[PDB]
Ligand code: CLA
Ligand code: CLA
Ligand SMILES: C/C(C=C=C1C(C)(C)C[C@H](O)C[C@@]1(C)O)=C/C=C/C(C)=C/C=C/C=C(C)/C=C/C=C(/C=C/[C@@]12O[C@]1(C)C[C@@H](O)CC2(C)C)CO
Ligand SMILES: CC(/C=C/C=C(C)/C=C/[C@@]12O[C@]1(C)C[C@@H](O)CC2(C)C)=C\C=C\C=C(C)\C=C\C=C(C)\C=C\[C@@]12O[C@]1(C)C[C@@H](O)CC2(C)C
């Protein structure tokens with residue numbers, strides 16, 4: 001009856017055990033929202049998209065700062081400020097990436113709403129397993145848990161890197177030391 | 178009552194709460210306002226029966242006591258030295274460290290973190306108002322485990338509330354006096 | 363934006379225009395504004411009357427404030 | 438509570454009992470006016486009405502007439518007084534013709550009872566009908582009312598002229 | 609000290625000196641008339657005191673903003689007209705007092721419409737009475753302060769003579 005994460009709180013009604021990373025940590029009861037097209041399905045899809053985006057962004061920042069930029073690309077070690085140097089010399093790359101992300105996000109929203117309507121697609125599912133790393137069950141749950149935990153950690157990390165780069169105008173590991 | 182004998186009792190200080198002696202001359206434990214509405218302004222839930230002002234006051238008193246105990250520990254620590262093993266914390270007492278650290282962008286971080294914890298535990302308070310069995314000040318935080326043996330739990334309860342009252346008054350004195358036992362006005 | 367968080371729509375929060383109107387009675391006005399909510403939610407013509415009157419008054423106020431305090435450069 | 442109700446418990450009259458039509462202030466104020474004050478003969482009502490009306494009528498004529506004067510002038514006062522008196526004469530002519538064409542009665546509050554009791558099988562509108570039971574609603578009553586209005590108008594206009602002269606001279 | 613209107617929460621049926629415990633209905637009606645007249649006059653007096661202090665458009669300015677000083681500056685022929693108007697008003701009130709069903713302070717004749725009074729009507733009458741009492745105390749304080757100090761309300765407050 002009590003949430004596993006917060007023993008002083010009752011179990012959130014909509015979070016039983018199903019989703020990976022579920023420990024009952026919903027103090028504000030946001031999982032019970034059923035308005036403005038927002039429900040547990042939409043919240044989970046948003047959480048998974050945030051997890052994946054944060055993982056990609058943190059990996060990119062760390063890669064560029066440690067191993068350096070790719071040939072022909074600007075340096076500076078400040079990832080929040082090197083973006084304007086890339087846009088100053090290769091605006092077409094940024095524009096094409098933005099257009100591609102826009103199209104993919106329109107497709108993602110359509111897929112989310114459709115799967116919410118005629119329930120056949122789990123939240124965050126895009127059938128993207130080209131290498132077959134999660135075919136069999138009893139490993140899919142473990143992979144989902146790993147992805148969720150890594151994505152939450154990378155969300156926090158990427159938000160921290162964004163704020164550090166905006167404020168200190170220095171590199172992430174530069175702030176570290 | 179057991180204190181201020183010429184006043185019988187407020188009305189609600191029956192004894193169901195720990196550390197109860199009956200001291201409430203102004204009868205503050207009888208206000209009909211459910212202070213959970215200071216958090217959730219509307220009834221919101223149809224199951225929100227309501228929270229008595231006495232239980233809200235007990236939660237507030239326990240929280241105040243814990244805050245004051247930690248506060249006097251910190252203020253006494255910075256009077257006798259004991260700076261964090263990092264730069265930018267040199268010596269600037271306690272009457273001036275607050276402002277200089279509010280300037281240096283980390284008191285805001287402390288505000289954010291404390292507010293996050295306060296929001297979670299206030300959601301706990303709101304669930305208590307909704308009608309959860311959780312008692313005031315009970316966050317089920319017993320990691321080391323010195324909370325079993327119900328007699329020990331009750332003794333530690335009364336101990337915590339009495340120590341919190343003492344620490345509230347002691348912090349009031351320390352901040353008003355600008356410390357006399359370990360520093361000067 | 364602040365004024366937009368006034369009327370109850372889908373949560374237990376905000377005002378009901380029916381309850382506001384029905385509470386505004388008086389000794390000189392009998393039942394007061396009781397039934398006005400039903401009038402303005404079942405008749406497009408009443409809404410058009412109110413909106414058009416206030417809209418024309420707003421247009422005249424705009425006309426006054428325009429020349430009174432010229433809001434455009436070199437106008 | 439409701440402060441507007443049908444007049445005299447009749448929901449079909451073209452009237453309402455508002456806090457202005459049937460308020461105690463309205464009752465007393467209209468009952469102290471000469472037109473409705475009890476115990477006044479029609480001549481007395483006319484005299485008081487004429488006095489008040491000439492008194493306030495000389496004002497606009499003297500102040501804004503064709504012969505004004507920012508200082509006090511006897512000619513301006515005489516012009517205003519004559520204009521007020523002639524206006525009172527015109528009003529008295531109107532009263533006289535109105536009373537001539539309106540009523541045919543010499544003693545009211547009785548003829549109505551006589552025709553409600555002893556039958557009124559005549560040309561009507563004199564025996565029967567008869568609107569209003571006041572003494573002002575007779576040929577004799579209205580004639581004395583007009584006479585009083587005219588005399589009181591003259592007297593009040595003269596009094597107001599004297600007061601205006603005194604105020605302009607000694608103040 | 610009866611079922612009369614005017615009993616509020618802080619002191620219900622406030623007759624500590626027992627003026628009403630022995631008086632008959634006529635004396636109590638007289639007391640209510642006096643209280644209501646004093647309250648209305650005092651509300652007018654307080655509002656006039658303040659407004660005159662910070663606004664005196666009439667008489668082409670002049671008429672010093674301090675009350676109890678403009679009292680001796682009005683042309684004294686405008687005083688006569690105000691006196692006569694108040695007198696005519698109170699003559700009309702006297703005429704009202706003999707109308708059937710008259711109530712002590714009721715010069716609007718609300719007894720004509722208000723039979724079986726509600727709680728809102730009683731509450732509004734009590735509101736008028738309490739505002740009148742507060743204005744009586746306020747105008748007494750205003751006059752006394754202006755007499756002893758010589759400064760008006762917003763002048764004494766502004767300087768800080770408190
Ligand atoms: C009410 C509690 C409280 C508060 C507000 C402070 C505030 C402060 N202390 Mg401090 N301190 C306290 C208690 C407290 N102390 C106690 C009890 C001790 C002894 C253990 C110390 C020991 C101490 C040292 C040794 C030093 C300070 C210093 C400082 C200052 C720098 C920190 C800063 O800028 O904000 C940072 C942000 C915060 C302090 C907010 C606290 C947020 C915490 C970390 C969140 C987690 C709390 C924790 C998990 C509670 C567990 C309960 C529950 C979860 C079960 C600042 C004025 C330094 C200084 O220079 O002072 C002059 C310094 O060197 N303190
Ligand atoms: C007891 C009430 C009272 C008395 C005795 C005075 C006396 C005075 N006022 Mg005054 N005044 C009052 C109330 C009063 N005021 C109120 C309530 C207001 C707010 C509107 C004002 C606003 C006011 C201004 C703005 C000025 C004066 C001025 C003056 C002085 C010159 C007379 C004049 O022009 O009056 C003018 C009075 C008015 C314009 C408003 C009077 C409205 C009355 C009080 C309400 C209706 C009365 C009605 C006939 C009787 C009630 C009916 C029913 C309840 C029975 C004189 C000392 C003048 C002066 O020289 O100032 C120093 C001046 O310029 N007064
Ligand atoms: C209606 C809708 C879409 C939809 C739908 C459909 C289509 C109807 C289908 C479904 O049926 C429903 C629904 C709702 O899904 C809404 C669209 C979504 C919006 C409104 C898009 C918002 C995206 C904004 C982002 C993601 C911007 C991020 C900015 C960054 C800045 C980066 C910086 O580097 C910059 C530039 C400067 C540097 O110095 C530092 C920083 C600041 C870090 C980080 O990235
Ligand atoms: C949109 C796009 C790029 C957009 C870039 C933009 C907007 C950038 C604009 C800017 O930089 C400028 C200009 C100047 C700056 O100052 C301003 C900005 C704004 C910064 C590229 C698309 C690029 C699109 C590409 C490359 C598409 C390739 C498609 C292929 C190969 C299709 C193959 C198939 O069609 C067949 C053959 C058979 C079918 O049956 C099956 C399939 C497989 C679908």
Ligand SMILES: CC(/C=C/C=C(C)/C=C/[C@@]12O[C@]1(C)C[C@@H](O)CC2(C)C)=C\C=C\C=C(C)\C=C\C=C(C)\C=C\[C@@]12O[C@]1(C)C[C@@H](O)CC2(C)C
Pocket residue numbers: 271272273275276346348349350352353
């Ligand atoms: C008055 C008070 C407590 C009074 C208690 C009383 C009377 C108790 C009386 C009783 O117990 C007895 C005696 C006996 C019992 O039988 C009866 C009662 C009646 C129960 C506490 C004040 C408490 C007052 C407090 C705590 C004030 C704290 C102020 C602080 C901390 C300021 C912090 C700063 O941040 C600023 C604002 C600015 C920065 O630049 C500088 C610093 C200094 C850092």
